[PDB]
Amino acid sequence: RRIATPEEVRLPLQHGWRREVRIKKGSHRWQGETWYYGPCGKRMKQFPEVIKYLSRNVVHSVRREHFSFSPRMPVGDFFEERDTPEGLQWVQLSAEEIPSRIQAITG
Amino acid sequence: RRIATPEEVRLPLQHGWRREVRIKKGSHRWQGETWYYGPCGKRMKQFPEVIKYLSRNVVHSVRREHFSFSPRMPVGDFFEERDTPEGLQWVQLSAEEIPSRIQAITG
DNA sequence: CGGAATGTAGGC
DNA sequence: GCCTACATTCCG
């Protein structure tokens, strides 16, 4: 439909949801995946899982239009898998780091 | 072998971990449980899972004494299970509601 | 205790 | 439908 705005994507975060973007190297390139945690703690990685979640709980403030799985949407916490001699290692990115990482997964 | 400070239990939150306290109606009474998320997104509910995770991952600033499974330690995000005629909703507590939930599960 | 066996859920 | 990855159970 219409692309969701930062503000709409921040809405479920005021009603007990968490949003994360997680970046790592695959086949050719670096890619991002978006995770959501529902207020009960359930991890969801696919849009239709959120649709199934929303229809199983009471329809209030939070609707499908507030959800984006786009790793380019700078809302929530960002993390990246860095390969090192000590092993694969996840680090949370600073606000200042996020823009370079979104540029690197656009396309 | 000695009590961990709030400052120390907040430290892994500055290194890509998350702590949550979740308060549900149990068998008899209201009880809380503590979850940690490792920087990789792994959910851990028991202290021996954390020690096992620390032993198989790069040993940076975060060490075993920075961790508490106490639902009466006000560090991280708090959620409670609120049952109504509309159904079981989980809701995130404000900073202002937290001290009264902790009192209610002290005891 | 640290790993293997088995169960489960969601991904493809 | 099976497969992969995670959660839980089981073992000496």
Strand C contacted by B106 CB (< 7 A): no
For residue B13, what is the DSSP state?
G
* Neighbour tally for A74: CB within 10 Å: 15
Phi, psi of B84 (to 5 degrees): -140, 170
Helix (H, G, I), strand (E, B) or coil at B53: helix
- Nearest to A56, CA basis, from A40, A72, A69: A40
Tokens, residue A73:
């949407």
Strand C contacted by B52 CB (< 7 A): yes
Q: Distance (Å, rounded) from C-alpha B62 to C-alpha B76?
A: 16
Judge: A92–B16 Cβ closer than 8 Å, yes or no: yes
Experimental method: X-ray
Helix (H) or strand (E) holding B55: helix B47-55
Residue with tokens 């507590």: B93
Phi, psi of B47 (to 5 degrees): -60, -40
Measured between CB atoms, which of A35, A87, A92 is closest to B39? Answer: A92
Residue with tokens 């696919």: A46
B22 — contact with chain A (CB < 8 Å)? yes
Q: Distance (Å, rounded) from C-alpha A23 to C-alpha B103?
A: 40
Q: Distance (Å, rounded) from C-alpha A91 to C-alpha B106?
A: 35
Closest residue of chain B to A14, computed from CA coordinates:
B92
Closest residue of chain B to A13, computed from CA coordinates:
B92
Helix (H) or strand (E) holding A9: helix A6-10
Q: Using CA atoms in the order A95, A69, A65, A106, what is the torsion angle rounded to 10 degrees?
A: 70
Measured between CB atoms, which of B15, B18, B90 is closest to A40? Answer: B90
Tokens, residue B46:
């028991």
